[PDB]
């Protein structure tokens with residue numbers, strides 16, 4: 001596996017974590033994630049230094065994660081704080097790796113690379129997720145594809161015309177206007193779908209519609225899905241700001257953190273349902289089926305030297321793909 | 335995986351196909367197989383040229399297969415016939431590979447190699463499957479073995495005496511007469527079982543008659559892995575040409591190096607309008623082929639790792655000539671093609 | 675795979691075997707295990723010499739195992755004794771490998787390695803299992819981990835470790851002891867909890883209680899059979915049991931002592947060891963080594979003796 005290890009990744013949603021550890025692998029590194037009694041999240045290598053047991057299968061004793069096998073206890077910095085055996089000696093060899101963690105924007109960010117290099121200032125901005133003016137619903141899915149396939153999926157939101165046709169079809173697709181903005185470690189794909197009638201989902205939300213997506217390295221995206229009367233200014237539109245963040249698990253699997261942060265109907269539980277239903281149907285079923293299928297075709301494509309043929313809808317995805325490749329090969333030396 | 339690509343293989347039974355595509359892998363090549371609205375079967379590489387989505391998950395739009403991801407449309411020759419995006423241009427890079435198909439003898443034959451070389455004259459003769467004088471029943475099985483193991487299985491039909499003993503055991507097995515005939519592209523293993531009580535199955539062929547019979551179990555192989563047997567039984571001394579018989583379709587197609595597709599059938603000249611005989615034959619196929627032979631050859635496949643790691647080679651018996659000759663011919667074909 | 679092949683391993687409990695063969699893989703070697711009409715167990719390579727079918731899917735014909743595929747028949751020595759085909763000649767090429775096998779102490783021992791070196795005198799002493807002074811029960815389980823992890827766990831659980839050649843004993847006596855819950859009712863006590871390891875992965879423990887001053891030989895006690903046999907690199911067979919001198923006629927006690935979770939491996943510990951196996955790749959890729967604790971003294975000694983045996987065999 002080539003991964004970009006010197007980057008922050010979402011390892012969990014905060015609501016996933018408790019005093020009961022969660023075991024999750026990121027970039028082929030198994031983690032034990034838990035919240036301490038003072039509310040601070042810890043991320044330890046999920047391999048007890050004694051005999052390699054899953055720390056994530058243990059419990060907290062006085063706020064310290066206890067290995068379920070022979071009961072070594074660790075603090076959130078990975079220091080061994082109790083050895084119930086023999087003289088109770090705690091040599092430095094009993095300490096476990098602890099990863100840099102930042103809880104921000106209702107996300108748990110972890111740095112799996114060179115710890116000397118982990119700068120929290122580099123975490124991308126998902127502030128809408130903790131803005132009182134926005135209502136945020138979402139969750140987690142696991143996907144049996146390489147993460148870059150789901151980056152591709154998201155950076156060309158045109159696929160929704162077909163993959164998600166029951167919800168997302170529109171006749172104005174004819175008249176799609178595209179636009180890509182490239183910035184420093186950030187790329188945006190803009191689509192405008194003018195004048196058309198609303199898709200099934202937008203009608204639940206003659207109109208203009210905007211589906212924009214912003215990528216920041218490595219694989220963190222925030223989209224902007226908006227619909228409004230024809231003629232209505234984009235900035236006056238009701239919108240969902242969509243969290244779509246990917247984290248590699250293995251070379252051929254990933255973690256998908258998704259969310260809708262909406263500026264409309266924010267006390268409306270029927271709207272909560274519309275959006276959770278979309279997430280359930282579109283993201284965790286329909287897209288999964290596509291990208292998992294493509295993953296299965298990788299061996300053939302690679303064995304036969306097949307390269308993708310690009311269409312007019314592919315600029316932003318291609319630019320993002322090249323940026324990740326650039327980061328991946330940069331790190332591979334050294 | 336080494337396969338012989340310049341050869342016809344059965345990809346499907348016609349009854350498996352419709353306007354809803356079937357995704358099936360042959361010789362490590364994923365295919366989308368469907369019958370167009372005009373009735374003609376198409377076989378496309380199951381990898382969209384754009385971003386590699388399974389066309390087999392798509393549906394027909396105007397009788398063209400539509401990619402389910404971003405909606406490119408293809409015809410049965412693989413030519414992109416609509417691009418929904420931008421100026422809608424369709425350069426040659428958007429065409430997908432199409433595979434030659436011949437629908438013949440109630441089989442779907444496909445050429446997985448160089449399509450310029452696909453010669454319908456080379457398709458083996460299974461005409462009995464479409465001869466109104468024969469009644470044909472059969473179906474499909476998937477097996478977790480290298481196809482060559484089932485070729486071995488079939489080219490020694492003597493295995494039926496043990497593997498299928500409840501149905502096939504004969505008390506005249508020890509009087510078996512064998513011949514092997516070697517032709518151009520073709521090998522036959524002939525077995526006559528003279529003078530025995532009919533097997534449980536043969537007695538059913540004969541509507542219970544339990545007096546002594548002669549029986550024949552012959553098999554013809556054509557390259558690469560298409561076999562047709564002759565299972566026949568008659569009152570002792572009656573000519574073989576006068577017998578009631580089933581001509582058995584036994585055709586294998588590699589899927590991966592360690593798995594294959596098994597297309598089987600019986601084309602019989604007796605009890606032609608008889609649904610209970612249909613059931614006897616389908617039952618045999620379900621028990622003998624899809625269960626009992628599966629169990630043997632899948633177990634053998636699981637032992638391949640050990641055999642190879644330990645330098646173990648098979649020990650041949652008098653029953654093996656035809657199977658060995660076939661194996662050596664498939665080996666020859668593989669080697670010819672490995673150039674390059 | 676790195677196994678120590680030159681040693682006796684348990685392949686089955688006698689009660690598992692009959693004239694219907696059992697197919698079981700030990701040290702990545704597929705075996706057909708069965709009893710002949712005279713009761714004597716044979717252990718054949720589960721690969722027919724003809725075309726490699728599972729002999730273990732066959733039946734006896736006149737006391738000889740018949741291949742299910744084309745009917746070759748073998749004796750317990752692996753000699754082909756009938757060929758149905760043609761002239762029926764039986765060249766030596768048709769013989770199947772037969773493994774040294776000894777039924778002793780209500781265990782079926784097999785030697786998977788160089789057969790020249792198999793000496794039945796070297797088979798570990800589990801005589802308590804057939805001593806009528808003891809009530810013996812047990813059973814079988816499978817675990818998806820490397821057998822060494824289970825040997826480690828067993829060799830853990832006035833202290834004393836005795837290291838000799840292909841045997842290690844870990845002794846513990848607890849004066850002022852506590853009876854186990856199991857033994858408490860058959861009684862100011864001494865307690866004992868000892869374990870004996872013999873190469874490669876065969877263990878016998880000694881769990882005991884008596885009034886202080888009593889010879890441990892005269893205590894209330896159980897001798898526990900705990901024998902691991904590698905299946906693949908990442909999986910193992912675990913033969914467990916106990917030979918006890920208390921409650922010998924109590925069938926309820928027989929039942930709890932036949933329990934895999936009660937006697938060999940509770941679910942929570944199986945979860946742990948199977949999880950450890952899943953971490954092996956990471957540990958190996960990152961050159962991570964275990965950090966030992968005071969409880970590891972015996973396990974480490976055993977571990978080092980196993981590693982020595984492996985190295986010897988890397989011929």
Ligand SMILES: O=C(O)c1c(Cl)ccc(Cl)c1O
Pocket residue numbers: 160168201211223225240241242243259260275278279283
């Ligand atoms: O997953 C999203 O961000 C999304 C939502 Cl919540 C609603 C509508 C559309 Cl078209 C989306 O793409």
Ligand SMILES: O=C(O)c1c(Cl)ccc(Cl)c1O
Pocket residue numbers: 494502535563565580581582583599600615618619
């Ligand atoms: O599968 C066959 O070709 C077959 C049938 Cl249908 C009936 C009887 C025998 Cl012995 C066969 O081998």
Ligand code: FES
Pocket residue numbers: 048049050051052053067068069070071072
């Ligand atoms: S493996 Fe964690 S304390 Fe032993």
Ligand code: FES
Pocket residue numbers: 382383384385386387401402403404405406
């Ligand atoms: S993958 Fe087929 S149109 Fe995009």
Ligand code: FES
Pocket residue numbers: 722723724725726727741742743744745746
């Ligand atoms: S495989 Fe055993 S007799 Fe043929």
Ligand SMILES: [Fe+3]
Pocket residue numbers: 153159160163164282283287
């Ligand atoms: Fe989607």
Ligand SMILES: [Fe+3]
Pocket residue numbers: 487493494497498622623627
């Ligand atoms: Fe058969």
